[PDB]
Design a protein around this ligand. Structure first.
Ligand SMILES: NC(=O)c1ccc(OC(F)F)c(F)c1-c1c(Cl)c(F)cc2c1C[C@@](CN[C@H]1CC[C@H](O)CC1)(c1ccccc1)O2
Ligand SMILES: NC(=O)c1ccc(OC(F)F)c(F)c1-c1c(Cl)c(F)cc2c1C[C@@](CN[C@H]1CC[C@H](O)CC1)(c1ccccc1)O2
Ligand SMILES: C[C@@H](Sc1cc(Oc2ccc(C(F)(F)F)cc2Cl)ccc1Cl)C(=O)O
Ligand SMILES: C[C@@H](Sc1cc(Oc2ccc(C(F)(F)F)cc2Cl)ccc1Cl)C(=O)O
Lengths: 205, 205
């Protein structure tokens, strides 16, 4: 129950490469994953502002409009050890309320948006709550190409150096009221362990 | 759009075995899968003795109707497969917002061995309503049955045993008790390089 505001909780997230060996055989590799004392440490949001878009509607504007307790930083250690392909993303959210949500994902390079994906999701009542599922949303070509470039680098420290300027900002809004339900800033390194993560609350002071 | 009455369409169905090699590596094998669209008809009296036949049995269900919700699926299962999860997934669509119940009866010699009943709620999707059964666990009877079938040295022996194995799936509107879909499944083992196969028929008379 880590990435959760008072209205929406992200239970699961994964980015993957699935390969069809034959009509009945598939192999799947997870690049990153979440959810496969719940106390979280805090990170001052001013430490990361220059790695995310910062004009009207940028991270600072979003954080200041609030609610600030919907803001999180996820550090990912991505697993790139992977040899008819489908690169996708899946995520699951739950809420006590029936809403229509919008998930906006901005891929950024040097703090500037390169691509934005916006998807609207409707609720399904399930086991006492409302559930929202983004199932096999295709990874953009920019990301697939970026993964291929990173794998051509001979050392993990070189991939980490390139990843230092790569970020993703995810903003989930209530479509009916336009309130921010969840906002997640993602930062990356390549794993030397498979995939790992660390979640923090974003605060100011 | 084959398995579809006027109120419910089953777009996809699959029964699978998923294996976790490591936290980021998964393998998936499909045993069976679905998804002019004309379908041939089969006289339902040909199959009555291979399904339960008391009050609420296949004949009672067919006679109550609507008869256009009744289908026979012949499956040629792919058993060529070497931390495991055996599941079933299915997806349905409907123009109406309903609370549905899916009852699946596994039968041996026309007699129920196990019944699984699950309730599904609608999700609004581009003008219509979708229903999803995602990774519903295969009962231990089925997993054990698959293991016994694989110990047989020849596919004709598996086919002889499978001649007395059937599954009846009934999807009902929980509130009105209307039969939305009723699918009778019969099995053989596939001998094709393409893996699993199926043939769908309408059940008539
Ligand atoms: N302003 C910042 O840089 C910053 C400040 C505070 C902070 O949180 C902390 F408070 F917890 C941050 F996460 C960042 C941040 C940001 Cl915004 C960024 F976009 C990329 C990025 C980092 C850290 C890092 C350093 N990875 C590099 C790898 C190259 C090596 O040469 C130095 C470290 C990372 C470390 C571990 C796992 C993933 C990523 O890559
Ligand atoms: N009453 C029946 O037998 C029957 C009548 C009509 C009919 O369909 C027609 F209307 F289209 C049926 F599908 C069945 C039926 C039933 Cl109800 C059953 F429960 C099992 C089963 C079959 C056919 C079969 C025959 N497989 C045997 C394997 C042993 C071999 O020796 C003969 C063929 C099968 C054939 C192909 C693919 C899957 C299964 O296994
Ligand atoms: C943009 C997505 S969202 C997303 C996608 C994610 O994938 C990756 C991010 C970085 C890497 C690499 F380390 F290699 F650089 C690899 C992957 Cl696979 C992770 C987190 C997020 Cl949030 C969408 O929605 O299309
Ligand atoms: C019981 C399920 S339903 C179901 C499950 C199905 O799986 C199989 C059926 C037969 C075989 C074998 F040929 F090997 F004998 C193998 C599998 Cl994997 C097929 C159709 C249906 Cl409808 C549930 O919902 O629990």
């Amino acid at each position: 129950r880590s990435v959760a505001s008072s209205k929406l909780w992200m239970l699961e997230f994964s980015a993957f490469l699935e390969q069809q060996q034959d009509p009945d055989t598939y192999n799947k590799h997870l690049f990153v994953h979440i959810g496969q004392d719940p106390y979280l440490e805090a990170v001052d949001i001013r430490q990361i502002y220059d790695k995310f878009p910062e004009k009207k509607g940028g991270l600072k504007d979003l954080f200041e409009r609030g609610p600030s307790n919907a803001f999180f930083l996820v550090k990912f250690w991505a697993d790139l050890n992977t040899n008819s392909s489908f690169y996708g993303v899946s995520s699951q959210y739950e809420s006590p309320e029936n809403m229509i949500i919008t998930c906006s994902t901005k891929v950024c390079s040097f703090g500037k948006q390169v691509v934005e994906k916006v998807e609207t999701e409707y609720a399904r009542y399930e086991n006492g709550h409302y559930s929202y599922r983004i199932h096999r949303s295709p990874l953009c070509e920019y990301m697939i190409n970026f993964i291929h470039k990173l794998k051509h680098l001979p050392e993990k420290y070189m991939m980490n150096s390139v990843l230092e300027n790569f970020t993703i900002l995810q903003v989930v809004t209530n479509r009916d009221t336009q309130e921010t339900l969840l906002c997640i800033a993602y930062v990356f390194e390549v794993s030397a362990s498979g995939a790992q993560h660390h979640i923090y609350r974003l605060v100011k002071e």
